[PDB]
Design a protein around this motif. Sequence first.
Motif, PDB file in Angstrom:
ATOM      1  N   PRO A 865       0.801  -1.061   0.146  1.00  0.00           N
ATOM      2  CA  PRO A 865      -0.038   0.046  -0.012  1.00  0.00           C
ATOM      3  C   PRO A 865       0.805   1.148   0.047  1.00  0.00           C
ATOM      4  N   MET A 866       0.272   2.305  -0.580  1.00  0.00           N
ATOM      5  CA  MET A 866       1.120   3.482  -0.459  1.00  0.00           C
ATOM      6  C   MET A 866       1.483   4.107   0.832  1.00  0.00           C
ATOM      7  N   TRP A 867       0.759   3.448   2.094  1.00  0.00           N
ATOM      8  CA  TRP A 867       1.230   3.946   3.157  1.00  0.00           C
ATOM      9  C   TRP A 867       2.771   3.290   3.606  1.00  0.00           C
ATOM     10  N   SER A 868       3.163   1.947   2.893  1.00  0.00           N
ATOM     11  CA  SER A 868       4.278   1.607   3.222  1.00  0.00           C
ATOM     12  C   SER A 868       5.560   2.415   2.970  1.00  0.00           C
ATOM     13  N   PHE A 869       5.392   3.037   1.924  1.00  0.00           N
ATOM     14  CA  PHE A 869       6.395   4.063   1.511  1.00  0.00           C
ATOM     15  C   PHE A 869       6.615   5.224   2.275  1.00  0.00           C
ATOM     16  N   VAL A 870       5.300   5.539   2.966  1.00  0.00           N
ATOM     17  CA  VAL A 870       5.231   6.842   3.927  1.00  0.00           C
ATOM     18  C   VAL A 870       6.294   6.216   5.181  1.00  0.00           C
ATOM     19  N   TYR A 871       5.846   5.029   5.716  1.00  0.00           N
ATOM     20  CA  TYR A 871       6.734   4.537   6.653  1.00  0.00           C
ATOM     21  C   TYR A 871       8.168   4.473   6.395  1.00  0.00           C
ATOM     22  N   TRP A 872       8.460   4.155   5.129  1.00  0.00           N
ATOM     23  CA  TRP A 872      10.164   4.052   4.660  1.00  0.00           C
ATOM     24  C   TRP A 872      10.548   5.485   4.627  1.00  0.00           C
ATOM     25  N   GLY A 873       9.736   6.641   4.692  1.00  0.00           N
ATOM     26  CA  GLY A 873      10.319   7.883   4.761  1.00  0.00           C
ATOM     27  C   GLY A 873       9.843   8.891   3.472  1.00  0.00           C
ATOM     28  N   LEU A 874       8.997   8.403   2.848  1.00  0.00           N
ATOM     29  CA  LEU A 874       8.479   9.030   1.402  1.00  0.00           C
ATOM     30  C   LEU A 874       7.359   9.774   2.050  1.00  0.00           C
ATOM     31  N   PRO A 875       7.539  11.085   2.138  1.00  0.00           N
ATOM     32  CA  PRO A 875       6.527  12.297   2.500  1.00  0.00           C
ATOM     33  C   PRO A 875       5.130  12.211   1.722  1.00  0.00           C
ATOM     34  N   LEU A 876       3.911  12.473   2.160  1.00  0.00           N
ATOM     35  CA  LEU A 876       2.754  12.620   1.663  1.00  0.00           C
ATOM     36  C   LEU A 876       2.719  13.807   0.870  1.00  0.00           C
ATOM     37  N   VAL A 877       1.912  13.897  -0.307  1.00  0.00           N
ATOM     38  CA  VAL A 877       1.875  15.092  -0.982  1.00  0.00           C
ATOM     39  C   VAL A 877       0.371  15.878  -0.385  1.00  0.00           C
ATOM     40  N   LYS A 878      -0.681  15.230  -0.459  1.00  0.00           N
ATOM     41  CA  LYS A 878      -1.694  15.624   0.295  1.00  0.00           C
ATOM     42  C   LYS A 878      -2.636  14.564   0.656  1.00  0.00           C
ATOM     43  N   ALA A 879      -3.505  14.633   1.870  1.00  0.00           N
ATOM     44  CA  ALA A 879      -4.315  13.615   2.284  1.00  0.00           C
ATOM     45  C   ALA A 879      -5.048  14.057   3.479  1.00  0.00           C
ATOM     46  N   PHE A 880      -6.180  13.320   3.500  1.00  0.00           N
ATOM     47  CA  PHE A 880      -7.165  13.743   4.397  1.00  0.00           C
ATOM     48  C   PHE A 880      -7.973  15.223   4.475  1.00  0.00           C
ATOM     49  N   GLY A 881      -7.859  15.838   3.240  1.00  0.00           N
ATOM     50  CA  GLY A 881      -8.319  16.809   2.923  1.00  0.00           C
ATOM     51  C   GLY A 881      -7.422  17.934   3.401  1.00  0.00           C
ATOM     52  N   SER A 882      -6.445  18.046   3.508  1.00  0.00           N
ATOM     53  CA  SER A 882      -5.171  18.781   3.873  1.00  0.00           C
ATOM     54  C   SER A 882      -4.750  19.686   2.583  1.00  0.00           C
ATOM     55  N   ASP A 883      -4.010  20.857   3.119  1.00  0.00           N
ATOM     56  CA  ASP A 883      -3.440  21.782   2.009  1.00  0.00           C
ATOM     57  C   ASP A 883      -2.234  20.875   1.436  1.00  0.00           C
ATOM     58  N   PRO A 884      -1.992  21.046   0.108  1.00  0.00           N
ATOM     59  CA  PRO A 884      -0.985  20.247  -0.793  1.00  0.00           C
ATOM     60  C   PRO A 884       0.494  20.883  -0.261  1.00  0.00           C
ATOM     61  N   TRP A 885       1.413  20.063  -0.249  1.00  0.00           N
ATOM     62  CA  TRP A 885       2.895  19.796  -0.013  1.00  0.00           C
ATOM     63  C   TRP A 885       3.122  20.292   1.311  1.00  0.00           C
ATOM     64  N   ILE A 886       2.496  20.103   2.314  1.00  0.00           N
ATOM     65  CA  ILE A 886       2.737  20.644   3.618  1.00  0.00           C
ATOM     66  C   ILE A 886       3.787  19.723   4.198  1.00  0.00           C
ATOM     67  N   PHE A 887       4.226  18.532   3.877  1.00  0.00           N
ATOM     68  CA  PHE A 887       5.212  17.951   4.242  1.00  0.00           C
ATOM     69  C   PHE A 887       6.330  17.704   3.542  1.00  0.00           C
TER      70      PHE A 887
END
Length: 1256
Positions: A865-887
């Motif tokens: 799942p995309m979430w495994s890459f997050v755990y590995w260190g890849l920051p999210l672009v936009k999620a749960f209705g947030s502003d884009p590129w805040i990570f």
Amino acid sequence: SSMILTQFGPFIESISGITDQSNDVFEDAAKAFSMFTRSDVYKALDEIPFSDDAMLPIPPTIYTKPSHDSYYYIDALNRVRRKTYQGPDDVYVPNCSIVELLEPHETLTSYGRLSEAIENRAKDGDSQARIATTYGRIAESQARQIKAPLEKFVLALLVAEAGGSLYDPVLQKYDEIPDLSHNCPLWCFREICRHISGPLPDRAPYLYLSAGVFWLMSPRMTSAIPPLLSDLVNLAILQQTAGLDPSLVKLGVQICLHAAASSSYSWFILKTKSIFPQNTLHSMYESLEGGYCPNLEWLEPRSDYKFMYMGVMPLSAKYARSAPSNDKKARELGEKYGLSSVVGELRKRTKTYVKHDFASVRYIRDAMACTSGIFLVRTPTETVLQEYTQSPEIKVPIPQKDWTGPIGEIRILKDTTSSIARYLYRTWYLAAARMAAQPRTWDPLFQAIMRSQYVTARGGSGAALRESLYAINVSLPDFKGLPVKAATKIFQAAQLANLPFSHTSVAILADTSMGLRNQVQRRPRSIMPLNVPQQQVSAPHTLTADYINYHMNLSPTSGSAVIEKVIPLGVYASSPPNQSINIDISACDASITWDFFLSVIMAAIHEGVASSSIGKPFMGVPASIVNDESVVGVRAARPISGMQNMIQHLSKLYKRGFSYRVNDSFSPGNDFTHMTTTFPSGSTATSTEHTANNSTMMETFLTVWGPEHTDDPDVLRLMKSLTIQRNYVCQGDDGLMIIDGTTAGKVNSETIQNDLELISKYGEEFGWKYDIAYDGTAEYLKLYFIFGCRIPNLSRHPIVGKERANSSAEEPWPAILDQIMGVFFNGVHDGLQWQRWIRYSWALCCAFSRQRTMIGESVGYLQYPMWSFVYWGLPLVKAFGSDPWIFSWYMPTGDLGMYSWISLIRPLMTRWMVANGYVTDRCSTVFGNADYRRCFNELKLYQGYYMAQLPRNPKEVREQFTQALSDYLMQNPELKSRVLRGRSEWEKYGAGIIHNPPSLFDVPHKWYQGAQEAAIATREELAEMDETLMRARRHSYSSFSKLLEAYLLVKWRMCEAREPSVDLRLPLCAGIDPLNSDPFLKMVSVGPMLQSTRKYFAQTLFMAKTVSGLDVNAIDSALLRLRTLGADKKALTAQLLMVGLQESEADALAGKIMLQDVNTVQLARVVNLAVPDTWMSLDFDSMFKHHVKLLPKDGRHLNTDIPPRMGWLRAILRFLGAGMVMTATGVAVDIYLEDIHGGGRSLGQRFMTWMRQEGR
């Protein structure tokens, strides 16, 4: 883009900041990538309306190439060799036809592999076939030097770029990076391939396979096409992701086209690799009219490599380039390889930068990114014959009369000698004596450590050892039936374990098996790994070398990561008024031979070690008796120590020379042993030995030779102001001469030139050819620096490239995921354009996240799942209705990073979950009324989290083996007695408190495990790994790790942005400027890390080193955890006895640990928190100390207070706060602890429960 846009539309917008990311879309995209046929990618390329500016002339001669046959021959020893035409170097793979040598593939009719008939004809000895097989195999190997099929990287680039320009959240504008219709590398890739495929339906010029390659059966195909194409893809991606100047990029494509047009791509690249740096980096500021550079102070002791930033240094004509001009040489190089237009253009552009600023260093960086990034390939036979054939020329040998009679294998160098050797002797003698006089040298633990140093999974010439040993009727146990890789020194240790030094002595002279490793922009590196008995005997050499590097010179012990290559030093050395000369010892191994160096060193050690090692054995080697013809006439039998005995046996090998067993897998019939004087690269002494000789000779030059060879007042002044303890930093064959300037500006260039020439002639005296470079620049440990600014070199980190020296099969999926993440982290360190890079990585990760499984006719699919890459260190672009590129890409890894991005948008997540039906009546302390458990399972967030944490590698004789390893380590009775005492003591004071007690008795099993994991996985094992993966994706969870559930109870408040730690007009890392917002602001707000990371972290451990097999960080964790858990001093004492320490030291270190004020980083280990690799280039120490406030913004809260005995919480809390600060895009901000749900007391117990439960 229609075909692409139609199939990846939703995913494209989610990674462009327009839509939220969601596993469903991510996985649909993954399914799309895996179903995309190879030729479809090329059809997708066809849809791109390339602009005229993306085109350039493509040399027709790239397609019509000669037969390989005139490029090889059989030599006197019947070895297939390369036939030279363009010089001594023209030994790589030649640019020739290939189709005539292939047999069509069964199913892929348009592709072919090397003819089976030709290979068998070669196997039975035919001369013509051996040649064709060598060419076929070597060309193939060249085509395999990549991580995966180029089409994956291209497809990902098309998907990522179909999203158009990205809006920078901080700059508040879209980037102006040109779209793909202007990408010349991509246009070339399309044309080259199209021209080659012609009418054929298959568009791919070659197919990259797990262990081989198939070529498109086109007469227009060449062996040079794969490398060419691989360079083009990297350039294509970098232009879109590093925002490289498109015009500079086209130059790099030209150079590659010329390499393909030549008779040997690899050879051509090797000869012209200096083009871009020489004509940019090395020629900057002929006219300096302004700008700023760092002003650093090098703290004392200089050996700590700790610097302090004091501000900026205004630039002016005063600091314009003063080093020797290189215009002539540079232009000659171009003319010689048909590239004068490129050199000319580059020189012209370089003269236009009259100020040193972001723009100029970015220009250099861009230019340096255009160099070919291929891993040069040639047959082992060729590498062996070129790197082990010549000896150094000792222009002033050591007079034969200056040696005494022999004392065994060695001779003492008389003090009356006039030779320069005199000094090389005194230094090693001195060091040996001090090294040997240290009480620790005679501590059993220390000796176990030295003996375990080389007990590893790596090869140790196992075959030759068994043969040399077999030659004397000494048979070694075979451990028949053990699932371990026999070709490991660990296995070797097991076999030798119960034999006296005397039975294995002869093994010290056994052959050495050559290994190989390819390099970018360089010839292959040979790997000569000594065997266990040889390494054992090498200890004295190695130990004395370490002593010298620790007490007598200014040296580093760097790895391969930018994070550990002392960035600060380069900054200092390259900042005007300071200047640096880059010095290198060329053909170092071939220049450290017996005739001068080794005969001297062996003697100095053998003698300097005599009085302190007097009547003792060492590391298992007994004292003995040697023939002494030292004193003229007299001839006695002199008793020598174990240590001396080692040197004695080592000298015989060093003196004889080495025998390299060459097994050329690419050249049939090329099996031979090669004798040479060239030093082994796989000895425990190699690197440290070269480092010590490097400085010792440089010291001798500055103190003696130099002064005696000139009366020039200025040169004498310069020389005198330099010291190997302050101005010369070296490692192995690399050296950096740092000439500090004054208020009167920088030292005279002409004066430096004379000094350098003296140094040059000095080396010829003892066979060293110094490679000196004085060019206004600093280059140390592969990092480049100009005016205090680091210039990352993108060409050295090929995005698609990968080193594959042998012909074994690539590692099975998903190892590629580890590599792709490794690609991403390189981008973070090298400072690519953060948004473009993050988006690209997401496309790349997604394109490799799915794997097809065949369980006996049953078709299935593994999907991360995309979430495994997050755990590995890849920051999210936009999620749960947030502003884009805040990570930011500085978001930590694992639990710390998960906690960071979650805390940043926690309210958002809660709001989103409820809004989408994920609501409950129970009130979550973190997510309120959100039914997070069901949400995270449905979105596969839990699944991805736990899947990411699974290892990506399939997992009576056993008791004998392990017991053997045990005898090897516990050889010395005193050491065993210590460990046993620790154990009985442990049952009394420490048992139960923790369950992770590190112990020497664990080492034998640790080694066995490693010998097992080194073996090649079985079909069943691979299948089990997949089943484990599918199980984790199918299982339903109800929470994260216990540690993450505890961090989530902690809430913060982000406040005022920090003031700049460093001037905003100051270039520190090219590419990291106002145009790359997040990295630039983080750099500016947090500030650069100004100390060697090795020296910084060495201060976070109670014990520097331990036996190879135990983790120093684990031991430090066990001790600190026992302390936190309220254990008694005696328990820490027990723990230290179990790792080898003597009760005296044990009891003392323990009592010290009980009363010590442990700083943030070290204490944080009690809960497995580590400083993130990505942060290593910034001042994280300062962030933890002054910018993470644990005293709430508005005073004290009952929940925020720290209980009296839980002050260790502060450490943990600092990491959490820093996590959020660094994860939030933009300037580092001040963060204030706002709350701890169940209070600090409850929180502490929660972590204590975790501390005591590890491994029950």
